[PDB]
Amino acid sequence: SMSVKKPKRDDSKDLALCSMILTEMETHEDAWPFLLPVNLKLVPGYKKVIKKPMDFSTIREKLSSGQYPNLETFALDVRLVFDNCETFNEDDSDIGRAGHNMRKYFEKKWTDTFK
């Protein structure tokens, strides 16, 4: 509350550390469904169904231009990528499996870097 604060957790390396995680996600062999925005002209149903599209290149641009206020808003966009994927793709599909795999990969790097 006013004039009453928990000890200051050092967030000065968060930007650099999110960038590293994102580099690792970009270079994963199963990243291909996620590297670029889904083409809303060429994929029937996507525009109407997926209210907030997100992909690694959009996260990269947001990160590089100071559009994440803190490390949690960064994680929320990464999770949005995978939540969108599960919304539109069957689990038993190459893309549905890719999204499960990448979500696991992310959540471990996230825990190991920050928890």
Curated annotation (Swiss-Prot):
Expressed at varying levels in several tissues, whereas a smaller transcript was expressed specifically in testis. It is found in: Nucleus. Residues 9-113 form the Bromo domain. Component of the BRF-1 ISWI chromatin remodeling complex, at least composed of SMARCA1 and BAZ2B, which regulates the spacing of histone octamers on the DNA template to facilitate access to DNA. Within the BRF-1 ISWI chromatin remodeling complex interacts with SMARCA1; the interaction is direct. Component of the BRF-5 ISWI chromatin remodeling complex, at least composed of SMARCA5/SNF2H and BAZ2B, which regulates the spacing of histone octamers on the DNA template to facilitate access to DNA. Regulatory subunit of the ATP-dependent BRF-1 and BRF-5 ISWI chromatin remodeling complexes, which form ordered nucleosome arrays on chromatin and facilitate access to DNA during DNA-templated processes such as DNA replication, transcription, and repair. Both complexes regulate the spacing of nucleosomes along the chromatin and have the ability to slide mononucleosomes to the center of a DNA template. The BRF-1 ISWI chromatin remodeling complex has a lower ATP hydrolysis rate than the BRF-5 ISWI chromatin remodeling complex. Belongs to the WAL family. This is Bromodomain adjacent to zinc finger domain protein 2B. It comes from Homo sapiens (Human). The lineage of its organism: Eukaryota, Metazoa, Chordata, Craniata, Vertebrata. The gene is BAZ2B. The chain holds residues 2054 to 2166 of 2168 of the full protein.
